[PDB]
């Protein structure tokens, strides 16, 4: 299902099994010597839970690696250093994540899409402040329960512009945006506007680079790459009299 690099070792998530490589080499999966056990050896832990949870995604979060699965979230960790015996793979939380969309972590939080039957609900995975290791997921769409249509293919965002945008295959034209701001640790702003680019403009996955977001659109005559940059004071094109808020 997915490829991750835990520690110095390439890792794969296949079914309910996490397979890691020898530490030095990402390609070699087998022990260097069968005769002598080495800490630098492949690992074949299998997730341990009473339900069936195939491991779809691996997300780095906090100071841990969280191996998410459709119905559950797990932490890959070790008792001390990593051997083929030390690794534990515990089961932190049981929130449901739809897996067409990779979870995106803007800052401390990791944002993911949960699929209700008609409209998706985006959630935020955070480490709860008081307890030593309890992670919880707030639902950030509780105020807009039926806004984002069900197909969600991308969750993309910018720390610099403090925003998360979810592109949904359901309503192709819109890029649904959440703008947030944390003062102290409180959430001062929760906003869920949508940006609509055109009547028939199917929007492929935008991905911000710095403060500039590169969007790919359909027409449906010809597809294009365009740029959105949040520059306060700039004239987007040369010689233009004033920034003209005109699309394309």
């Amino acid at each position: 299902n997915d490829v991750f690099f835990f520690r110095n070792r390439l890792g794969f998530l296949s079914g309910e099994n996490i397979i890691l490589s020898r530490t030095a080499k990402y390609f070699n999966f087998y022990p260097a010597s069968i005769a002598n056990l080495s800490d630098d050896d492949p690992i074949d832990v299998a997730v341990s839970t009473n339900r069936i949870a195939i491991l779809k995604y691996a997300v780095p979060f906090s100071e841990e690696l969280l191996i998410w699965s459709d119905e559950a979230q797990f932490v890959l960790t070790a008792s001390g250093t990593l051997t083929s015996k030390s690794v534990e793979l515990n089961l932190t939380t049981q929130f449901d994540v739809q897996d067409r969309a990779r979870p995106f972590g803007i800052g401390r939080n990791v944002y993911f899409a949960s699929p209700r039957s008609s409209f998706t609900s985006i959630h935020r995975y955070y480490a709860v402040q008081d307890v030593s290791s309890v992670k919880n997921a707030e639902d950030i769409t509780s105020h807009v329960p039926n806004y984002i249509p069900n197909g969600v293919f991308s969750i993309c965002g910018s720390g610099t512009e403090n925003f998360c945008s979810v592109l949904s295959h359901g309503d192709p034209s819109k890029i649904f945006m959440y703008k947030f701001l944390y003062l102290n640790e409180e959430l001062r702003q929760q906003s869920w506007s949508h940006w609509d680019f055109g009547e028939n403009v199917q929007v492929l996955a935008c991905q911000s680079i710095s403060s500039d977001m590169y969007v790919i659109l359909r027409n449906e005559f010809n597809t294009f790459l365009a740029r959105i940059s949040f520059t306060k004071n700039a004239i987007d094109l040369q010689g233009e009299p004033y920034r003209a808020f005109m699309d394309m």
Binding site: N1, D2, A35, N36, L204, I216, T223, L225, R227
Partner: protein
Amino acid sequence: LNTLGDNGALGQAPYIHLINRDEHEQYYAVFTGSGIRVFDLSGNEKQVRYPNGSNYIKTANPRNDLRMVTVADYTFIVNRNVVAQKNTKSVNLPNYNPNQDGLINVRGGQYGRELIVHINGKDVAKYKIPDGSQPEHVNNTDAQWLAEELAKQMRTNLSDWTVNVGQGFIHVTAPSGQQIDSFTTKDGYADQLINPVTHYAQSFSKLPPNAPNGYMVKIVGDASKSADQYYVRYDAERKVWTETLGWN
């Protein structure tokens, strides 16, 4: 910035990933589901050759199947629909009978010892080392002469088997049709005078001192240190026993 071709150029549902490796190496990569079309952020197509095949990319629904993880050294594309498999075609020692090709290491002689080596239950070779006239016998107590003497008797008794002498070893190779069922040899002294050696050794220390260029022995456990039984292969050039990958 640019137009990236017709509506279907990128496909109905492309998986598009941004490879932000460097300031100058910012590229977008789209998976049409029929191929890979990479675009510079200025909109310029960058040719993707597909040496070594292109079928992995081909998928009906590439938003959902191809997953791309980008690490600084390499970018990995994983199709989730595809299932990993082993090649039955490439095998080590593909057809291998441990039974054939056994070796006997003659190391010494002493007066009055009957050298009896029996293969397949018939005492094939019977050479009694003799005493009573010392100068001829000191010449006779030597291992090398004993080996050649044993070999010639063995060749007559085993016409099909090919017997080849060595520095200390006597290598008995069965014809393909036949195999060595019993390799027991009676030294007439402790196991020291001569020793039957099979492809299994209780310990690395109990390994034949000299051997053919490829003799493989499986070092079974000494039942002292916990270990996984391992396979060791001799190299004549370097005179080192090393370690290997198994026999079938």
